[PDB]
Amino acid sequence: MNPPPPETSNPNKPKRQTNQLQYLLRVVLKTLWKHQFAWPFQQPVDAVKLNLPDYYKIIKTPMDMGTIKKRLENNYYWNAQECIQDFNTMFTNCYIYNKPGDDIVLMAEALEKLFLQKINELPTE
Ligand SMILES: CCc1c(C(=O)Nc2ccc(F)c(S(=O)(=O)N3CCOCC3)c2)[nH]c(C)c1C(C)=O
């Protein structure tokens, strides 16, 4: 079966607004979210629905842009690097589970390239 999705809230964890976090939501995440190849990454992998019973045997640190979006929207991240790390985990997972030439790998590559292009313009903190 599926695990519960990653937490999108931490109670009593303090909260802040920063230019970097705003940029991560309204520029980086927004741009990736709207890309033609975003759809496979907009929610947790549903291994039951997609019939991938080994997925969560292999991937022990799941991440997706749906989770990242909700973390940003709920001020779950204090440091920009926490968010950048989540993006990195998402892409890495795709290369762990899938093979060269797979459609999902081509899509992750395109999204990762776009991610790098937008993170290049991240404001200073
Ligand atoms: C290859 C499986 C996979 C996906 C993926 O999502 N495949 C997918 C297949 C069929 C679909 F229909 C949709 S869907 O986006 O349209 N969809 C999801 C929400 O419910 C409605 C339908 C998505 N994503 C990742 C990271 C991986 C792997 C194994 O790495």
UniProtKB/Swiss-Prot annotation:
Identification of the protein by name: Bromodomain-containing protein 4
Site (Acetylated histone binding): N98
Other comments on record: JQ1, a thieno-triazolo-1,4-diazepine derivative, and I-BET, a benzodiazepine derivative, have been tested on tumors with success. Treatment with GSK1210151A (I-BET151, a I-BET derivative) has strong effets on mixed lineage leukemia and promotes myeloid differentiation and leukemia stem-cell depletion.
From-to range in the entire protein, with total length: 44 to 167 of 1362
Family label: Belongs to the BET family.
Record's subunit section: Interacts with p53/TP53; the interaction is direct. Interacts (via CTD region) with CDK9 and CCNT1, acting as an associated component of P-TEFb complex. Interacts with RELA (when acetylated at 'Lys-310'). Interacts (via NET domain) with NSD3, CHD4, BICRA and ATAD5. The interaction with BICRA bridges BRD4 to the GBAF complex. Interacts (via NET domain) with JMJD6 (via JmjC and N-terminal domains); the interaction is stronger in presence of ssRNA and recruits JMJD6 on distal enhancers. Interacts with NSD3. Interacts with NIPBL. (Microbial infection) Interacts with bovine papillomavirus type 1 regulatory protein E2. This interactions may serve for the tethering of viral genomes to host mitotic chromosomes allowing successful partitioning of the viral genome during cell division.
Tissue specificity of this protein: Ubiquitously expressed.
Function statement: Chromatin reader protein that recognizes and binds acetylated histones and plays a key role in transmission of epigenetic memory across cell divisions and transcription regulation. Remains associated with acetylated chromatin throughout the entire cell cycle and provides epigenetic memory for postmitotic G1 gene transcription by preserving acetylated chromatin status and maintaining high-order chromatin structure. During interphase, plays a key role in regulating the transcription of signal-inducible genes by associating with the P-TEFb complex and recruiting it to promoters.
Domain free text: The NET domain mediates interaction with a number of chromatin proteins involved in transcription regulation (NSD3, JMJD6, CHD4, GLTSCR1 and ATAD5). The C-terminal (CTD) region mediates interaction and recruitment of CDK9 and CCNT1 subunits of the P-TEFb complex. It is also required for maintenance of higher-order chromatin structure.
Bromo domain boundaries: 16-122
Cross-link entry Glycyl lysine isopeptide (Lys-Gly) (interchain with G-Cter in SUMO2), positions: K57
Record's subcellular location: Nucleus; Chromosome
